Design a protein around this ligand. Sequence first.
Ligand SMILES: *[C@@H]1O[C@H](CO)[C@@H](O[C@@H]2O[C@H](CO)[C@@H](O[C@@H]3O[C@H](CO)[C@@H](O)[C@H](O[C@H]4O[C@H](CO)[C@@H](O)[C@H](O)[C@@H]4O)[C@@H]3O)[C@H](O)[C@H]2NC(C)=O)[C@H](O)[C@H]1NC(C)=O
Ligand SMILES: *[C@@H]1O[C@H](CO)[C@@H](O[C@@H]2O[C@H](CO)[C@@H](O[C@@H]3O[C@H](CO)[C@@H](O)[C@H](O[C@H]4O[C@H](CO)[C@@H](O)[C@H](O)[C@@H]4O)[C@@H]3O)[C@H](O)[C@H]2NC(C)=O)[C@H](O)[C@H]1NC(C)=O
Ligand SMILES: *[C@@H]1O[C@H](CO)[C@@H](O[C@@H]2O[C@H](CO)[C@@H](O[C@@H]3O[C@H](CO)[C@@H](O)[C@H](O[C@H]4O[C@H](CO)[C@@H](O)[C@H](O)[C@@H]4O)[C@@H]3O)[C@H](O)[C@H]2NC(C)=O)[C@H](O)[C@H]1NC(C)=O
Lengths: 204, 235, 1236
Amino acid sequence: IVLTQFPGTLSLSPGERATLSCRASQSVASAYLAWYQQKPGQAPRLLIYGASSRATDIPHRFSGSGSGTDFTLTISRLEPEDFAVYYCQQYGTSALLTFGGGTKVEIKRTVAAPSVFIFPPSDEQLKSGTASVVCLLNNFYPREAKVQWKVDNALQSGNSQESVTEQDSKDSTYSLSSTLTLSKADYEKHKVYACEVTHQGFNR
Amino acid sequence: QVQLVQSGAEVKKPGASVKVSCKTSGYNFTGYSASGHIFTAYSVHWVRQAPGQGLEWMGRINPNSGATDYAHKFQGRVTMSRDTSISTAYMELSRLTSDDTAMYYCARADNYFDIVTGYTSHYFDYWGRGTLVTVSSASTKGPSVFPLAPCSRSTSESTAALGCLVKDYFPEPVTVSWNSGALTSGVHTFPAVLQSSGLYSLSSVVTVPSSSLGTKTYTCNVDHKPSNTKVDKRV
Amino acid sequence: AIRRYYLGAVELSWDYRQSELLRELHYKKTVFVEFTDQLFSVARPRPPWMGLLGPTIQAEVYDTVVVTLKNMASHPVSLHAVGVSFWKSSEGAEYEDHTSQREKEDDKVLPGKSQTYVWQVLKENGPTASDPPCLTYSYLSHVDLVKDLNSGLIGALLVCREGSLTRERTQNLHEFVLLFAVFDEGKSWHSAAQPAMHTVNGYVNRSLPGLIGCHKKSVYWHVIGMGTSPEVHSIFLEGHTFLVRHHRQASLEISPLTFLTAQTFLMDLGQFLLFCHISSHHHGGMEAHVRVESCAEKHPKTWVHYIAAEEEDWDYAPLVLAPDDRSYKSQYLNNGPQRIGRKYKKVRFMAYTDETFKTREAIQHESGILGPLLYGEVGDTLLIIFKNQASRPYNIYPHGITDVRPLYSRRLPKGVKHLKDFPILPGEIFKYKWTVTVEDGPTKSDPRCLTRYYSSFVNMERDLASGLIGPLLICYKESDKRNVILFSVFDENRSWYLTENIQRFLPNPAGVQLEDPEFQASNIMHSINGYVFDSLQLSVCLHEVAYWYILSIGAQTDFLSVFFSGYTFKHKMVYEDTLTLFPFSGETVFMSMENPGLWILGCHNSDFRNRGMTALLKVSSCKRTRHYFIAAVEQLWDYGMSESVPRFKKVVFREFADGSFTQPSYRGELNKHLGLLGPYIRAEVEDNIMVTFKNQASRPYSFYSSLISYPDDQEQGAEPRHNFVQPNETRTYFWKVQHHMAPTEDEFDCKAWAYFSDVDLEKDVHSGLIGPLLICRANTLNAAHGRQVTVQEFALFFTIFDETKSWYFTENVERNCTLKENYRFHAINGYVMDTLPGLVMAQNQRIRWYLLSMGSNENIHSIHFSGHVFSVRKKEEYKMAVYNLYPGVFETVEMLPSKVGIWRIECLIGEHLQAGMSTTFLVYSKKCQTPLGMASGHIRDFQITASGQYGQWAPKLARLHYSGSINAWSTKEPFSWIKVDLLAPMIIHGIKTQGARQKFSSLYISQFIIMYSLDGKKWQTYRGNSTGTLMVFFGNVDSSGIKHNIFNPPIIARYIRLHPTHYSIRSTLRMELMGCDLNSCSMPLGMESKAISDAQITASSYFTNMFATWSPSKARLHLQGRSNAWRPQVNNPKEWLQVDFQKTMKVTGVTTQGVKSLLTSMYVKEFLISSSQDGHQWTLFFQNGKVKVFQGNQDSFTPVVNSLDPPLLTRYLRIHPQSWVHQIALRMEVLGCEAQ
Ligand SMILES: *[C@@H]1O[C@H](CO)[C@@H](O[C@@H]2O[C@H](CO)[C@@H](O[C@@H]3O[C@H](CO)[C@@H](O)[C@H](O[C@H]4O[C@H](CO)[C@@H](O)[C@H](O)[C@@H]4O)[C@@H]3O)[C@H](O)[C@H]2NC(C)=O)[C@H](O)[C@H]1NC(C)=O
Ligand SMILES: *[C@@H]1O[C@H](CO)[C@@H](O[C@@H]2O[C@H](CO)[C@@H](O[C@@H]3O[C@H](CO)[C@@H](O)[C@H](O[C@H]4O[C@H](CO)[C@@H](O)[C@H](O)[C@@H]4O)[C@@H]3O)[C@H](O)[C@H]2NC(C)=O)[C@H](O)[C@H]1NC(C)=O
Ligand SMILES: *[C@@H]1O[C@H](CO)[C@@H](O[C@@H]2O[C@H](CO)[C@@H](O[C@@H]3O[C@H](CO)[C@@H](O)[C@H](O[C@H]4O[C@H](CO)[C@@H](O)[C@H](O)[C@@H]4O)[C@@H]3O)[C@H](O)[C@H]2NC(C)=O)[C@H](O)[C@H]1NC(C)=O
């Protein structure tokens, strides 16, 4: 019933086999277990039915195996047409349905130099009344590089927001933007503005 | 040629009930009771998916007899109904909560079945565009868009990032183009995030060496269909 | 009443070189002999001319027969009776009968092993006076039919009327038998020149020592064919009249195995010849001198016929109907460097009105080559004047004539001996007198019209090929005239004057090598009357009924299959599809010409029709719409999984019921067996057939059932019916079947026809596009089922299928392989032996089959009702037990299966039978339906399997009446599959199940379908009782419901799995099968009931007193009350119980059970079995050389069943317990039936 996907997220160069395991709590037939595929920001798609047989007009590159409580989707060669988020799932029967954890499949990207930008609210921002300090970072490593609004041994939390770009379908890039939702005076009281910078290697 | 069309983006306040339709085309209204377990595309399966999570079930409706089942989370939160002859399924999501903003799809079960000998289908192969449902007690808000340009006294790198932030705007869907469509290089758009203020925040950037190039129309355009506004702003 | 015979199998040395064995009773042959003592020492005095034939076997109604066939021969023999009932006494065959090893004897016999084969000859076997005088089967031997009947083993199993045991009027002539046989000596193990030999009772040409006939007596002759290969031969007595009751029969016929009972009344004396009337190159030597000796001590009118034989030029193509010049046309209707030509000179008979024979008649067209018609009546004084004008002396002599004599003299004193060969010199004139009988009393139902011909006998084999033919008619009265058809093959090589023809027609006789196929084939031209290749027109006005007289004299050297398109021609009270004529024989065809259109004739043969032997008739002009949306679908077919792989693309008829061709009427139960056939196009009187044929496949085909009719569109014109329905295109052959097609009241309930794609017969029956039509009389097919429901029917279609003879041979070179021998499948309904399912029938219910043969000359497959014999109803009531199949004839037969168990539907021809024209069929018993024992624990818990336990909820506890906590098979998923893995194919008669209760909820399955399988790969849902695609079983709605489920067609399988459709909450069920073993024997006789008298059950000691009433008769199963069991006076291990059954009964299952009394449980744990006939002789039931010591029961409530593979015997059955629990008491009941 409860479906878990191992690993949670995988990055692999196109053309190589990828194996995604599915674990359940219930001794279920492999007929009631399948695998769907979803492209980002789009409707998903049926990939493999019955955990062993391929669906309509899908090349023999994919395959499925397993039963009972352990299932496995194995793609012999993967291409960017199918680099997507994949879901093992039990369906239809027992009157209830649920989906997998959605293992996003990624393309391996070389370790390049990340880009960092920081901008305090300029004068136009100040007279707009929304003096939001912003910092953005792009083409980085890793995806989960966590930064926080560190000012003079001070946390800023519970008020900021962060937007994360979806993985690029061509360059597999990622980008994050952290912005503050605060009034002008709340920005003006502080004097130094910056968010902490972590890598492998500004006046009011 | 089977179509599973759905309505467009709908915005409602929490506590009410939003009804979304799924019009089916390309099959007679019923595919029998699966008395032989042959063609089971009749069964319309709802599903919803949030920006920050994978898809999760809602319910099943059989047009043949009107039978239905629902996920245990939505026994009193979602209700289901079928039309008479217009071939459209109606779902009503009641007791709305601010988290319900997501993409809602409708499905049916038509492909194959891999068991000892059984050619029914319990697998989704038919699927519409996706209804964007936005739920928030706030009313519509216009394009509070602000530019993000490098400081004139801090511009020395060859590469400079330009941005525009549509803040506190509402509701979805809202589009942002860059350079008024004159340039696509380095154009990126951050997904909308629900701020602590409860309204939407979007950021669209260009990473092209705008400092290296001369003055060019880096005038990004913000389009808000619910408010019918277009704002072109030069950074 | 009882008859007994000590037969035996003797090897002997017979090279056929030395015949006329007058010193008998003294190649390698194995032949039946008869003895007279149990010691098997002295043979019965046998007649010296039986040759290689076995003894003769008599019987009567209800008269038992006890054969005692000892195997003296050096290799295994068998006995194989035909047309007589038994119980695996004489099945003979090595096949899948599924019987106990006690009955496995007949399969192979070592030297010695006298054996004993008993048959009963019930009333349905024995005939009456109105039936044929004495049925004449052959009790052949079967272990490998080709070699067994090439070893000569054969006999004459006669059965006929009661009261013939006494030698009052039965010892006359001893009822000697005749066996026209073709013994193949070459392909036996007795080798390391042996040509086939035609024989009459084993004696080759003219050397049969003296069949002796009576001067003036009516004698019964018994004719039994024999042969393992096809081909036949007619039988003729040169100077004896052929007439039987009302059968207008003149030629006595046989076939590779066929039984006939001829009757001949003699008037004359001397010597005649039994003659195989065919001039075969290696055959026709089956002649035997018969001698007839003294066994013991009006409307007179004067007519004349003038006739003269003279030469004349004739053509068979009066018009230029040969546009093509190279494909098979010019070679036979054009003249050239290597072919004789179109028109040739032949010598005929023509009439001349004058006495001087100078003025010829106005010879009419279409009456080619044939002579004038002749006709005679009662008291006729016709005299016939013949003249010769040809370059040779010629003469006439009628065939089978009543009386023929010279004229103006008692005898010819000159150098003329007889009229049978007396020639007439060129120009000479002679006179003959032909006369008929006088004292033939009127009957009003006698054969009044009969057809024969006349030819020349200066050289018959050359006279017929030279054109020497005239017709002859015999009709009784106490436009109206019609020319007759003469089917023939006239050979110029055997013609008298081929040299004249070749010198006159070939431009240069430099060289033809005398062996070129084209010239030789042109010599043998095929003619219908005197024409070939569409040279006939027989336009006759409508309405008026037609009387035709159809003959086949020529050089065809095989049998005919003449068919009329668009009509059926009235035989003796029956209307047939295609009719068969042996050469030198013909018949009076009656017909109706109410059906206009374009119609062509033909031999129906694959090659004879293409030889221009066609002719065209060209008549021209002078309640409920019963739908059948039939279609033609393409299937990758496997002819059988026995001895290897057939995967050829074949085309087949599949019925539908809706305009949208979407439901291919899946093959369920009744229509399982149709294999490569199509649907049952049934109809009654007055009905309307709305057959909306649709077609598929790369090549277009069509539909035809001898009843299609082109509407007379485009008046003042005529074209063939278009048919020829293109791919994806449909049609609608809607026609109205006429009332002349109704079977008579004396006829069977419903006659059957064959329908096929007539566009090219020879290339699509091999593709399988064949199907049964069923026209039935009056109103006897009511209800939605559209059948008689009174009788269960099946479709037998015997045919060899050749891939090279089908369009798909190119598509079937796919497998790695090069000749048609590797692609010949001797199929019955498209399946070759041990492969055809669907054949299940009720023993209490009379059943009907539809027997057909379609195809070449090879298609002479004979059919034998193994263990059954029935009565034909044509004209009157007769009886029969072996049937032929002449191609094209669709016939209805019956064989009520009173004897239960597997059988075989037998094809007699040894080459075919070893190739596969027979495959099993099973009849069960409606008496036995006992539960297969899921509740009894007999089906252990591991067998049942499904998926989704998840809660310790195993399916292994899905047994009925189970109670206690978690007590059923439950899943929450709506899709579930419970597998009752039986592991032994048996007859499933029904299902019984209840629901379950958990806490307070009630759970069950409201509706479900069933899936039954024998192999675990093919799996078919029960579709019985028609009126639907498949049956959706009415499930249970409460945990305590009384559900009386039955199966109308009982499943035969070993997996019966339940697929639920509609259910409440979850699936939680407990199920119990009702069934029986495959042979339908396992059933209690009634020991539990009072079927056994109390005096029959006795004990060594029995505890009976004021307080204890433990009588032995109280040992009945489930008996409850005071002393509800047997207890002995003294409880000692020597106790033992006797049950009397009055005779030997076959018991395979015994149920034992403990008892409870005085608040304690008592049960015997040690027991042994014994049998005896009188209680004095001591025989224990041997059980693997020991006494089996079971633990047995663990309580006193559950009865357990133990199987006995060797059935117990004797009238006295004895059980000896050894040790007990708490006292000595048991409850007993046995399972079995009657066998011997
Ligand atoms: C394809 O989809 C269609 C729906 O889009 C689905 O419906 C079928 O419709 C036909 C036509 O009405 C039904 O056919 C029935 O046939 C029975 C006889 O078996 C009739 O008695 C029915 O008549 C009813 O209605 C009359 C007027 O209201 C009444 O007066 C009368 O008393 C009957 O109640 C009717 O003609 C058919 O049953 C339905 N199908 C189902 C499952 O109900 C059709 O089934 C779909 N086809 C497939 C193959 O899935
Ligand atoms: C029963 O009688 C019939 C008569 O109608 C008989 O048919 C003929 O049998 C003879 C048997 O000799 C066949 O002759 C064959 O043909 C060649 C050429 O003519 C013969 O020379 C052969 O006979 C030879 O056989 C001997 C042993 O091999 C030789 O040593 C010797 O030289 C002989 O010449 C060969 O057998 C003939 O073809 C047929 N058919 C006719 C005449 O139409 C039939 O065979 C008799 N049955 C038996 C079992 O004998
Ligand atoms: C007359 O007879 C039949 C009518 O039933 C018909 O033959 C069938 O045609 C269908 C298509 O109309 C064939 O189905 C094919 O199956 C293959 C199996 O792999 C598919 O790949 C095919 O699909 C391809 O082609 C389609 C059309 O180009 C594409 O849309 C699709 O995406 C695929 O690329 C196709 O569906 C079926 O196999 C045949 N069956 C037989 C027995 O022939 C025939 O066409 C009718 N008409 C004529 C003029 O004969």
